[model samples]
Target: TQQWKTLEDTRSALMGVYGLTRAALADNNTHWICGDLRKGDFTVYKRSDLQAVSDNELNKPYDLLKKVSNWRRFYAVINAASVFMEKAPRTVELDRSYSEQNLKYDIAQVRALRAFAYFYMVRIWGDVPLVTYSYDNGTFPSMPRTDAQTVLSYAKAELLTAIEDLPYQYGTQTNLYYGSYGAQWQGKLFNKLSAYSVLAHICAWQGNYAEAETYSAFIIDHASEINAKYTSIADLTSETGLFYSNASVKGSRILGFNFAGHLEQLTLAYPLVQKSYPEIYISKDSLFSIFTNFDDLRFGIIDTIKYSSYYVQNLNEETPVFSKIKIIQGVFGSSIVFTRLEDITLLRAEALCALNRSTEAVSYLNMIRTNRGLREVSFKKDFGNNRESLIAEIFEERRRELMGEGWRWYDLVRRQKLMKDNEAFLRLISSGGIYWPVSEDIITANSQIEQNEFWK
Candidate 1:
């Protein structure tokens, strides 16, 4: 519990932990897990179901080209989160208030981040180690794969603790900029509400209907109190909100990474630039095929001509290239990609409806839809007096609202109870294919953990 000798040391250490989440936003790596995997974006152009194309047959190093070719980077993020969480806290001493506060915040952030990593892993892999502690003095921790229930519980516990101390919103004053703004760009970084949203997600995955309902409701009711101020999904794309100065954060963003225009340009330029030309843009045909008749405005933003063809071309045909993430051409190009207000709202609605509070759920869901210029879903006709049907409808709505944001695969996994038995997602992404194979390097380095049998 000793404090750091210098504030700079403390800051440096905390920043290192923050870097894990920050790294995810680069090259839309996180998007690969959420968007590309779901075939909701242009990466689908390269695959059959747009789930993911494998390169194992090509004899390529699995981790090197996983996202584009092998799907290994997603696991790298998970492995990084586990390893980062282990060492990040040690960077600072615990005695000083500044050090402790910073450390706690970083720990919380890491926890939230690790929880996210595990949440995705569990959904993908089914069973995985819930590694919480840092590796000790060259000693490797080789815990067996924890059950989905245990992993979800761990995720819930860590996120709930994180939400308790995380500031509601960041970036009030200049000094606060580093502390708050440094936490997440705009609302890109993880905060209390973001933690809450993640907690709600964990609960939902575990089928803790009541807990999910309560946690999500808490987030929705006090959304404005957490930080700068919570924004609706409608405000997400507004010029004054997420779309503001390249430096400005999205008002609806609960946690996210900031990618300056320069970074966007770099990412676009390197990987077969698709941002500049309409021919390379995510066509209306793609959007229509993916979302169908869902009336969400995001479809319009992504599929429309509002974006420059050059920009679209740069997106590699991934429609709606998350222009909101594009910051100014210079300055910090990539940052943490975490929570957003729309995610929280959708979770709250899903939880509420699942708990038999259909009316309230509809109201919350409508809040997002109405802001997006779409009509509110009428429960009376949509539900037909069946709670299961209502839950199904809400989940579908979430799929559309959260498309390309990285919730689909996990959503499928968590709801596997519903999906697996019903054959809802069997053809879409595979029932147990939620987690990627542990990297061959990891297996070679540690003898304790075996490659998931399913991977073989």
Candidate 2:
């Protein structure tokens, strides 16, 4: 076979930069606002220092916001792929076997991946340089941050286009029986349903309720079809049965799951909570605070198993090591779940509740509980029937269900938006407190760029 002859081969050549993008997304430091670096050793950015900034610090740039070099690196990698996509010829000049179907799927893959990169960056930086090409001698050239809203709008549009042609699964014959990740390449590339999940999230974040509702409903109506490739909690036995399965189990990785065969991701996943790299864990006391009928399953139930590994260990303090993100010695460790069925299902519930439809929202929520072997939470009491209360309920549920998955700070930001009467949280969200600062290098690199007001 000729190099880059087939769609799979094209993806392979273009995917080298994807690893860099993954490193950026997985970099724990990116979570300061949404995550806490509470342990002792995270000398760089402690939750306390990050949260308690002085107005003086806000008047000038800080090193904290400067961490976006990773974003630049991310853009470069994905852009490299775009360059390949633009140049790759579909003609038999390469392979006579290629069809319009092959070219279409390949292009969609690039768009989905690229759109996700910009969307993720927009969430953190608010306005970031939105470059779509690898450009000029492989150099960054120059561009200023596009308005966050504008960039997100672009991302959603790209998602709508890219998702249309993607298959229900990745690689070959994914539409066939048991077409899971490993069975079909660990769900590495974006597929039709997974693209919707991403679009659903982007929509929810942007408060595009009608759009969000549409995307979420798509997932729900297609639940049977989507789950044919993606395993839900209902499919769990003693085998793939833990909440942890959302990350480590390739089969359950409905969207954006990765496998790192080189150098492994052990250091990234399993570190001391005391160390800043602290792998994202909650304290034993804090962990037990969220109780439920099925106390013996997923997350809180499953997370407690490694207490001694850290307090005794040291680094990323005593962080959280997902049972699903398995480590094989120091050689190979895989699993970085950007999104899975459970996360999206919950998000769908959230969008529904926000749109003031608690009944439909409850339906989605119950699916998780039922799958988890637990009873449904009540609409009348557990969270109440009001929008504010229901949102709090959905928010708290997301907190418990998706802990250490890099959502805490953003979750705080979202709740602050709703909790207007709560002066304390309002104070937190106001004054640019919710966003991160732009690094000096980034600011200097582009004179048009300025610090995020909160971190000025």
Candidate 3:
């Protein structure tokens, strides 16, 4: 009475895992709000819950906060992926068409997806239970949180194994994978480059810059496999450009999810097309400070007038609407990019700088800067042999390049770790305040789960 005995069954099972992955993140715009605005730059309008998150008041009693604080949604993703991993292997034995190669690739995707879910949870909650097997017998087990480092290490191991089996491009051979070509699988499935991208990020998060360098170097060497390249400012903000679901297969996309429509974007874009104030926006001072270079293609002042591809300024001298991701409701659907080429490239630069290879790091940094119409950084003028200054420059570039794509908070964490002198940030770190509180529902159902100490 099992379902996964045929190739079609395998596909359905795998797709269910992917569907659950998307749902876990997109259920309440949870992913963006966590990474994008947590003590980062953008200011809130009137939504106190978002402001609470932005201000790092994560222990509030808001319903939105409670829902987002829950870790069950991510566990749902893990359970589904684990289920597919457990059951789909039978398809290779039962169906003649299900080649071992196809099974390898499918299993690799599941592993990467599962690892990605854990990595994301670690970033948010700091410590989370690592579950790898499907408990299909209807007897749910209670688990305690493993330390964050252990969870990240587990994720790193999973990604390493996954990268061995994943292909850079899929469907080159018509006989493989249901005859779907590489283009069909481009942004929808995890490939070698995308999995490597995740691996690179995991290494960086764990402060293993040497491994991060190696993995990112692999992506840089074989970026063309996924057509991942630096995206133009025009394409980055255009309706039919980078954010569009159809445009997802382009060189800019590394790993992302495209939604038919997104709930939060209706509010993010309301100010632009709907002709009202936005719920969140950046001030002119903040915008200009980040993009200091006037000729920067992302944002700047030219001839006493301001021009910016990233924002549409409010003339009343109030908060400027964030126009970087303005995929409105009617026209183009919302695209939430997890890691693109520039993101990985910048990570490579960060790793290099951390290793004191500042000169070499400049090459990667300048690749993004020059493409974005900013002048290249001269090693001697910018940093000379100062690793701290060079690393700071790279972080700034990341801030400018990845303004609204949900990277700021993590970057801030890494930056503070580097400096190690910010009293407030250090307090958040020492007191376990950096991580979100586990939802009460989880604590109630499973006594093994404990509330984060800072929240208690």
Candidate 4:
């Protein structure tokens, strides 16, 4: 079994993958992947290389499948968890005092992390092999792709077991917001709320709005037990709150990487901070009309953060560099908020919309908009009359409120699902256009791993 004192590997793998994800989103069509073969000058494809991969939108050198096709790193998160989960022992051994409960919790964490990784892959790739054992000894197990919905359902079910096993916090005592982990672990480790957060997202992604609403309600009703908070501008703008030098400061983020740096022992983030890097950009001259959004208090912070040495491009860009995220001191410090109350609240609104309670949905949507300094909405009486409009409004709020927080690509997909009965969304999905091919290497490595129809 690969499960013998493996928390270190498990933690490192989880953190490293997240760092790569943050970087990838900054560079790629993270918000919207593989848009069109007839490439126009979209804000994201400012680079020539990304445009060159027009044939297969997901087949670029810098894409997740590459040995790094361009100026990006190979996506190694899947293998990290698979390899660890492959070897982790299913049941603890005896005669060693049964190893106490730490190993069990660690194993459960691995389950949740793999669930998260699979969720990411499934959204893009759809069907993927569901593995739960180690392949570390040069004996790889070839498996066929499982249906994405089945995989998610399984993962959601697994989290139920995890919720029972995971403690509310770790370490010897509560520090900051998480358990102190005997002065070792803190804010970043998974807890009960972490499981709940992922469960909520999984339920929503599957269009199980009733379950999703229940899970979000759990977080709202048990905020104290979960150490949860609804994020605010003060929390977002304050150094110690969302972006700190050490990432030890606590707020609403249910779980994220610590990005304390090389980890010589490591941690999470939005961007690492660089001025001239092509990883992010808008057209050199597009700032004029882009300035129109100054009313959005969230985007308004761009100017204030620019003078702090955050990279906002040039003088004309007039935006903060990686304004959605930034660096603290010299470490990768920007937060990749995985889950938070505001996020769930927005999600609850979405769930309500799907459940035919559009009025209830708009109420939550207005809560976020007003909190962000935007004007409020009140067509509650007419919500049912404008279901699609209300849904679009709710998604727009999510787009603004959660910008650069790494929810873009999937949010659009979910939007499609929410409207799947419509002919447009129905064909968009049924035609196999929304899915990406398995990376070349993955299919080649495992004969059972098949390519998506569009890619094939």
Candidate 5:
């Protein structure tokens, strides 16, 4: 079972686990998950993109969805952890501390990581095989899919165990960029709080209200401790701060990838740098369409530009482009894959409110709103005395606040059960379009798995 007999072997195994995050973010693959376009020139392929489609494109979306639903992407990380678990234990002959604590930390990380990967799979794919142990060189197991609830249960167990072993934050030796203790290793990587954030979301997604409340409380209670090490919601505007630092892990970022220049280049900047803004670009619309008052700080960062148009001499040709993630000069600049902080804060607020702690929830929610220079929101007054309406408001806030960060689809999927009451969403769900169709190649390759019933 022990594959690593030396310190060097243990180090290499740990590095392998660390490498997965980097690989995940290398080509802006995470952006695809977030529903961000791979390139402005190419139409973005998103799960939501499929949902908005008509019958004519049903087959195409179904095919691509299947590919995305496959377990292969997650298995890569799980297998890496399995390898580390096998090799790391034997290094007791070398540095006992390194072999034991360090290796344990790495194993815990991979375990939590694999759990997250599977959690995501279960959400998207419905039923996925629970691969607990590493298969190593053996043939892929012909295991039947576990129920989504079962997968979630396994993830919760793994995450709880990981939280006990992993440090609250990785220090300087382990964390390179951000000066804070808990900053995101990058948007791609996970730290202890990142794992907890995932845990909180998983609990909420599964309707484990009590568990969700507990995790959310832990995050809110430890906000200062976590904030000291990572970036906080308040740090969003500081130019030289963590938010702007490419590859820097701010104390507030629980989990995120360093995308400052890299992602902008691959997806947005590279394709859009020379090209004129798309006629359909959503940025053209005023914030009033998305947010009622146009008072939100989300619009504060845009830069106004005047284009000369001889044909329309009398008309003013002024437009504003979002400068939030546009840090790098060329296509290859840094951006961030925001995984934690802002959303988690709102999540905590929602959980607290749902538990009848309206006062507490309003406090947390207002903290975010106030930081954005917007009017403070009150659950009772603004939402018309209805809790559901308040929830809707919070969801809208997330949409407007976290746009282009890749959360819309997952948010929709997570809240699918509630979509029935909302007419606009009901139409999308009724058309066999709620979830992306699993890809065709996967069904062809793995006879054991069939495409989703909705696809047919």
Candidate 6:
């Protein structure tokens, strides 16, 4: 009771939800392990766990596999958010400084965040228990898994409700949460754009591209309000630019976790930069194929100076290091972006393409391509007037632009689902193999839980 009585308590509790959400994604490098490295292009050399991931060995008897597969961290976020939603309203009445407006905005974020956690789990583990309660007091009850579609719709509805109250930028009109100003809130907290970004992805995931297009269009149209812009390749790879906590807090990042006070950098970066014999690197052939256009700024050699913006060659003898995200070796903090302008833009393109609006879709696709120093590709000239070919080009751009940002595997799944041509991939989708197996530990603790059919 006393915990939710003060404005400080509400602030602390709200931040706890955000922290838990970040931890859920960052721990075991879950986001990267699930999104980037599973069947990813990078070749693994040293880490068996990573190799297992790349080989689609989800239930491997490895700590990394087990930890990443476990959905407890995501549930922790949901529980904290649910608790905040229920308890934080009391602070407005009890604390003199805690206004109703503050409570309204905070509650909006709490609701959306809670649903986001479920949506994230739905993506990884398709049928998750849709627990809304905090389950506090150190007691729990058995719960069965909810269908993935149900979870995604709930997430979409939460974002829709949250969008009405979520501010475009925090501390803009006044010194908002933690007495910080607008500039300090860049990419740090979930705002209207963040909700829209998440909502767009959820819609796309559920094959509701019409809704996805609407949501993504809202973000693209209102990009100026939050100053969301496509990052230059230089800024994208710079240590102090996109991924670094300092620039991310004040940079073009739309929605991300500024892992302040985090003692260690992401283990995802360890194989690429921290080790003498790195665990993973993209093969030279994969690099050339992924970055098809010679003038693409992400890779290639310009005389002696290699344009190793996205990747650095000669770092290892076997393959090129995937260097899109480079955190300072001793930095206390780094940022992991959930979505940005480029990402949403591409999603918008995909949505439009899915809707059979090739002409409109190419416009959004070219926005990213041109910004990345590639010539604008046309429907007739590049894709041979085929919508599928055009869609393929857009995904190729995403593969190139979004390399190592933890969207590859999901991109592959979405693309394969749309194309429906790859027999192996289509079977993976149909059999629920695209989703990770619910951890054995989870099933052991909760006998009611059923492993997915493919994993089972």
User: lDDT of each prediction vs. the true structure?
Assistant: 0.53, 0.56, 0.79, 0.57, 0.56, 0.79
lDDT tens string, model 3, 1-456? 449878888887887777778787777777678877788777787889889998899888899899999888788878888888888888888999898999998999989999999998898999887677887543446788889999988888898899999988787764556667776667767788888888898889888999999999999899888777778777777766777777754546788777652523524543356646666777777876787877787774221235434444443446566766766653547677888888888999899988878889999999999988788887898776788888888889999888778799889888877767589998998798989999998888778988999999
Off by over 4 Å in 3: 136-140, 248-251, 260-271, 301-310, 313-317, 329-332
Q: Could you give candidate 5's per-residue lDDT for residues 86-144 as a string of tens digits?
A: 66676775565453556666677888777777776665556676777778443556666
lDDT of candidate 1 over 1-456, digit per residue (tens): 423455555555555545544554444354444333442344332332222322222124433334432223334454555554465465555334344555566566666777776665565456676666544433445666567788787777767777776866554555453455543444555677777777776777777878877877787677666443444443443334553434344445565555331223322332233344211124455556655544456554443344432123223334434343233322334333345566677777767766668777787777766776577667787667665676666666666665545565566555555434556445433434444565565556567766655455
lDDT of 4 by residue, 42-72 (tens): 2443455545443345554564434222211
RMSD of 6: 2.6
- Clash pairs detected, candidate 3: 227-251
Model 2 ranges with Cα > 4 A deviation: 1-9, 27-65, 68-70, 90-92, 171-182, 226-249, 261-280, 292-296, 299-325, 330-332, 427-430
CA lDDT for candidate 6: 0.79
Whole-model lDDT for model 3 versus the true structure? Answer: 0.79
Could you report the Cα RMSD, in angstroms, for every candidate shown? 5.8, 5.8, 2.6, 6.0, 5.8, 2.6
Q: Is candidate 1 or candidate 2 better by TM-score?
A: 2
Estimate the TM-score for candidate 2.
Answer: 0.77
Model 6: runs farther than 4 Å from truth?
173-175, 248-251, 261-274, 301-307, 313-316, 329-332
**Which run of 10 residues does model 1 get worst, by summed lDDT?**
49-58
Q: How close is candidate 6 to the true structure, as a TM-score?
A: 0.94
Q: How well does candidate 1 match the true structure in TM-score terms?
A: 0.73
lDDT of 2 by residue, 1-456 (tens): 326666456656546546655666656334332243322112222333343331213323444434533356567656765776676555325765655666677678777878887877776667887776667643565667778888888888888998778776554454321223424444455667777877887887777767877887787577555443334432322223322323334545566435442212222343421223432334444544553444424532333344422112221244443333233434433344566667777777777776778877887777666655467777877765666777776776666555545565566566556546578657755565555566666667668776777655
Candidate 5 regions exceeding 4 Å error are 1-3, 22-30, 33-58, 61-70, 94-97, 136-138, 171-189, 228-249, 259-272, 275-280, 301-322, 327-338, 415-420, 423-433
Q: How well does candidate 2 score on lDDT at residue 334?
A: 37
